[PDB]
DNA sequence: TGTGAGCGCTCACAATT
DNA sequence: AATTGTGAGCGCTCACA
């Protein structure tokens, strides 16, 4: 049985409360008293049983996070910025990873997070409107913030402005004089993917352009490669491609190149994310920058505000920007 | 105040213990009684406060994980396979991410994980031998498994066989007839990086070869690009490069290509990891495969065995393999 | 500074029938 | 002999003293 707060009480000549104050950096200590207590716990290697502290009522803002597999780029980047910002605010973070596809899986995840009595949830998992509303409802009394829902979902959410991203992309290709444009989208089961797809159609339409092709990948470079290969093998050869993410763009670029065409000069390409690696593709990839650090930082700040009944309900849009490189 | 075990007690006509039995799938229930209780908690949307269950003494296997930033490839892949395998074993997982560089930071992380009374720790953070031994010592009574230490560290650990990876790389370049070989290593502050560096030197030496260059990156493709550019600008132009990871290899390939040289035909390249993207680099990257799923899966199984006083102490080496692609062709 | 109380549950028994 | 209750406590935080 690990050292208790009681064990330090006698090994310091004080009570369990005296030690408590010391541990909590409380106000009103016997000055030199704290010096003695700390030495007492130091020699016994005392580590406050957080499990007991929480139950006892210690107000510790504990953020829960239901997320897509961390094996995926953006999710990992986001959780990272979340834990980082939470540590910086003295907030704790427990995360439930959802691997199985489906709303039940996400609900299971929210269930456990709730069991750990989190003071708020951050759901970074693709959810259709009613499913999101359902999840939001299951969050018994605790606030929920969503990161993978449409801007049209009636719940608290933060997402990058797909409107701005897709416009930037389309307008860039247009200003370069492209008219034969193909679209490589993320998996349709992804809300974010769908939002980008919609964004492209919206702005391509406003420029009286109709994509000469439209395929669906799964976020992986291999899918980008295969999809762009099938497209080219069907004789459909555009002069520019808008791709849902940098990784698929990479695969597209491989297919283009292994076909005898020059990325840029023959078929321009635009990616999405502006991942670290994108600046070193052959040739450097023009892309839309999504500052994941900012999303994770903002997510935590926001979930805390909500937890404090602060009037900041709704949907928030994060800025993005065009990074001009050599693929266009 | 969320629904208590007490709330179900009267909303079912039983006591808190009766409900407890039903919740824990206990032995000796009133048969139909459990049928009633379950219905009672179902209608009240009851979710057992795990915090209270743990304190009360409920024996649950909770794995703690101190790790390098999840913003890095391998660590994120590893934590994912860890959480995945733990969920599959009905084990819970809490993870403390260490961002600040240093042993104190890692100790801080272990401190918190201990505060949550985990039944074991998985440290995936670069630790020199004495620092690792120190951390291991701080793990008051609970078993610790390390993933970023040397195979020579006297503690429980699991790492990929750098010996096999570097040999595979070196022997491959040699069989292709390369003699002018440059080395691009990961950051020296990384144990894993150093192990690979050592491995290359070891096997290059056994083939009577001396690298004509040896630079250090930081795992990022940009570092791979910059380092390989400085190297080429100094007039040092090898015929093959061994790179500590696929991302730096990417940067190297960019530098090689933007220099008028053909990756493969003029300067061969070998990476490390066999990341998903590596199969789609221009041209496809020959690399050393490190099965991160396997590492995370094995780590959990192993930490649990240790937790059960199973005699499996020491260091374990995981296999790796060479993935031949196009960067070492012609 | 001490004291009382409790957080939600698990134990260990006891207590029902 | 089945089933239920009862007592106690887990480690700490509160509220007071
Ligand atoms: C920043 C956005 O990134 C999307 O990121 C995704 C998700 C998985 C793999 C790659 C990408 N991507 O963009 O390249 C998320 O689905 C969305 O919920 C939001 O987190
Ligand atoms: C599988 C191995 O990967 C190494 O991975 C690293 C670590 C950070 C960024 C990239 C890589 N990498 O290999 O490309 C770890 O340092 C080592 O502890 C172990 O986890």
Pairing of strands A268-273, A240-243: parallel
CATH 3.40.50.2300 domain extents, chain A: 60-159+292-317, 160-291+318-328
Chain B residues with CB inside 8 Å of A252's CB? none
**What are the residue ranges of CATH 3.40.50.2300 in chain B?**
59-159+290-316, 160-289+317-330
Which tokens in the block code for residue A53? 């502290």
| B291-306 b/e (C-beta count within 10 Å ≥ 16 → b) | bbeebbbbbbebbbbb
Output phi, psi for A291, to 5 deg.
-70, 85
Which bases on strand C have an atom closer than 7 Å to a protein beta carbon? 1-12
Q: Token digits for A213?
A: 């092709």
- If you measure from the C-alpha of residue A248 to the centroid of ligand 1, how many angstroms do you get, rounded to a whole number? 12
Contacts of A168 (CB under 8 A, 6+ apart): A288, A320, A321, A322
Mode of pairing for the β-strands spanning A213-216 and A181-185: parallel
**Angstrom distances, CA of residue A130 to CA of A68, A176, B198, B229:** 19, 41, 56, 53
Q: Is the dihedral of CA A306, A311, A312, A313 positive or negative?
A: positive
**What's the CA-to-centroid distance between A238 and ligand 2, angstroms?**
39
Cα(A102) to centroid of ligand 2, in Å?
31
Fold of B1-58: 434 Repressor (Amino-terminal Domain) (1.10.260)
CB contact under 8 A, A222 and B279: yes
Asked if A282 and B282 count as a contact pair (C-beta separation under 8 A), the reply is yes
CA-based torsion, B244, B247, B253, B259: positive or negative:
negative
What are the structure tokens assigned to A57, written together?
A: 């009522």
CATH architecture of A60-159+292-317: 3-Layer(aba) Sandwich (3.40)
DSSP string, B39-56: HHHHHTT----HHHHHHT
A1-59 belongs to CATH 1.10.540.10: no
C-beta of residue B325 within 8 angstroms of C-beta of residue B251: no
Of B48, B95, B111, the CB nearest to A47: B111
Q: What is the DSSP letter of A263?
A: B
Question: Reduced to 3 states, what is the DSSP secondary structure of residue B196?
Answer: helix
Nearest-atom index, ligand 1, CA of A147? 18
Residue A313 in tokens: 């309900």
Ligand 1 pocket test, pick from A245, A247, A275 with the greatest ligand atom count within 8 Å of Cβ, gives A245
Residue B318 carries which DSSP code? E
Distance linking the first and last C-alpha atoms of chain A: 65
3-state secondary structure string across A34-94: HHHHHHHHHHHCCCCCHHHHHHCCCCCCEEEEEECCCCCHHHHHHHHHHHHHHHHCCCEEE
B202: three-class secondary structure by DSSP: helix
Rounded Cα gap, residues B14 and B53, in angstroms: 20
For residue B202, the distance in angstroms to the closest alpha carbon of chain A comes to 30
Classify residue A177 by its DSSP letter.
Answer: T
Q: Which nucleotide is nearest to A24 (CA to C1')?
A: D13
Architecture of domain A160-291+318-328: 3-Layer(aba) Sandwich (3.40)
User: Across the interface, which of A70, A114, A117 has its CB nearest the CB of B80?
Assistant: A70
Residues of chain B found within 8 Å of residue A220, distances taken between Cβ atoms: 276
Experimental method: X-ray
Please report the beta strands in B1-113, taking only residues with DSSP state E, as ranges in sequence order.
62-68, 92-98
| 3-state DSSP assignment of residue A309 | coil
Name the closest residue (CA) to the C1' of nucleotide D8: B56
- Secondary element (H or E) of residue B273: strand B268-273
Q: Which residue has the tokens 């500052």?
A: A291
Q: CB of B192 closer than 6 A to ligand 2? A: yes
Ranges of beta strands (E only) in B279-320 are 286-289, 315-318
Termini Cα distance of chain B: 71
Cβ of B72 closer than 6 Å to ligand 2, yes or no, is yes
Cβ pair A317, A159 in contact under 8 A: yes
CA distances from A320 to A167, A173, A184, B69, B119 (A): 11, 17, 20, 24, 43
Two tokens, residue A233: 């093998």
Q: What are phi and psi of A82, to 5 degrees?
A: -70, -60
Residue A117: CB less than 7 A from any atom in strand D: no
φ, ψ for residue B272, nearest 5 deg: -150, 130
A273: which 2 tokens? 């994310």
PDB resolution in Å: 2.6
With contact defined as beta carbons under 8 Å apart, do A268 and A54 qualify? Answer: no
Of B164, B168, B144, the C-alpha closest to B317 is B164
User: Which positions on strand D lie below 7 Å from a protein C-beta?
Assistant: 2-7, 9-15
Residue A238 φ/ψ, nearest 5 degrees: -70, 180
Give the span between the Cα atoms of B204 and B129, in whole angstroms: 26
**Residue A182 · residue A238 · CB < 8 Å:** yes
Q: Which residues of B touch A114 (CB under 8 A)?
A: 47
Q: How far apart are CA B36 and CA A221, in angstroms?
A: 53
Distance between CA atoms of residues A282 and B259, nearest Å? 12
The CATH architecture one would assign to domain B160-289+317-330 is 3-Layer(aba) Sandwich (3.40)
Cα–Cα distance list, B184 to A136, A186, B198 (Å): 49, 34, 12
Four-CA torsion A106, A111, A117, A123, nearest 10 degrees: 10
Q: List the B18 CA – C15 C1' distance (angstroms).
A: 13
CA of A308 to C1' of D12 (A): 25
Which of B75, B248, B278 to mutate to test ligand 2, by most ligand atoms within 8 A of the CB atom?
A: B75
Helix pair angle (B191-205, B162-175), 10° resolution: 40
Cα gap A179→A156, rounded to integer Å: 38
- Distance, CA of B69 to CA of A226 (rounded, Å): 32
Question: Å from B57 to nearest chain A CA?
Answer: 11
Distance CA A69, CA A84 (A): 18
The encoded tokens of residue B70 equal 């999840």
Strands lying side by side in the sheet with B181-185: B213-216, B181-185, B240-243, B268-273, B286-289, B321-323
Measured distance CA(B82)–CA(B300) in Å, rounded? 6
Query: For chain B, what is the total number of helices (H) and then of strands (E)?
Result: 12, 12
Q: Alpha helices, DSSP H only, in A176-276?
A: 191-205, 221-233, 246-257
Which residue spans of chain A are classified as CATH 1.10.260.40?
A: 1-59
Nucleotide C5's nearest residue (CA vs C1') is A56
When the candidates are 3.10.20.30, 3.90.850.10, 3.40.50.2300, 3.40.50.300, the CATH number that belongs to B59-159+290-316 is 3.40.50.2300
Q: Which of A47, A51, A140 is opposite residue B140, by nearest beta carbon?
A: A47
**Nearest chain A Cα distance for residue B49, angstroms:** 5
Which class for B237: exposed (0-12), middle (13-18), buried (19 or more C-beta within 10 A)? Answer: middle
Which chain A residues are closer than 8 Å to B251 by Cβ?
280
The structure tokens listed for A190 are 């992804």
Rounded Cα gap, residues A138 and A150, in angstroms? 19
Structure tokens at A323: 């990074």
């Amino acid at each position: 049985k690990p050292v208790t707060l009681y064990d330090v009480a006698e090994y310091a000549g004080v009570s369990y409360q005296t030690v408590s104050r010391v541990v909590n950096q409380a106000s009103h200590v016997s000055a030199k008293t704290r010096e003695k207590v700390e030495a007492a716990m130091a020699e016994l290697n005392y580590i406050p049983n957080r499990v007991a502290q929480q139950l006892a009522g210690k107000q510790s803002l504990l953020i829960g996070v239901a997320t897509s597999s961390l094996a995926l780029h953006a999710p990992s980047q986001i959780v990272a910025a979340i834990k980082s910002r939470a540590d910086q605010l003295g907030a704790s973070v427990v995360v439930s990873m959802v691997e199985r596809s489906g709303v039940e899986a996400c609900k299971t995840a929210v269930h456990n997070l709730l069991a750990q009595r989190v003071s708020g949830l951050i759901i970074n998992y693709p959810l259709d409107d009613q499913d999101a509303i359902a999840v939001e409802a299951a969050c018994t009394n605790v606030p929920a913030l969503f990161l993978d829902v449409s801007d049209q979902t009636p719940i608290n959410s933060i997402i990058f402005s797909h409107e701005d991203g897709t416009r930037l992309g389309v307008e860039h290709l247009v200003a370069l004089g492209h008219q034969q444009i193909a679209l490589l989208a993320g998996p349709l089961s992804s809300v974010s993917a769908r939002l980008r797809l919609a964004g492209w159609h919206k702005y391509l339409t406003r420029n009286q352009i109709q994509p000469i092709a439209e395929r669906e990948g799964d976020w992986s470079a291999m899918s980008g490669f295969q999809q762009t290969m099938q497209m080219l093998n069907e004789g459909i050869v555009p002069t520019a491609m808008l791709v849902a993410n940098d990784q698929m763009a990479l695969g597209a670029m491989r297919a283009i190149t292994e076909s005898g065409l020059r990325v840029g000069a023959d078929i321009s390409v635009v990616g999405y994310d502006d991942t670290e690696d994108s600046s070193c593709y052959i040739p450097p990839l023009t892309t839309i920058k999504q500052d994941f650090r900012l999303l994770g930082q903002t997510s935590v700040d926001r979930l805390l505000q909500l937890s404090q009944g602060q009037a900041v309900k709704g949907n928030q849009l994060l800025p993005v920007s065009l990074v001009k490189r050599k693929t266009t």
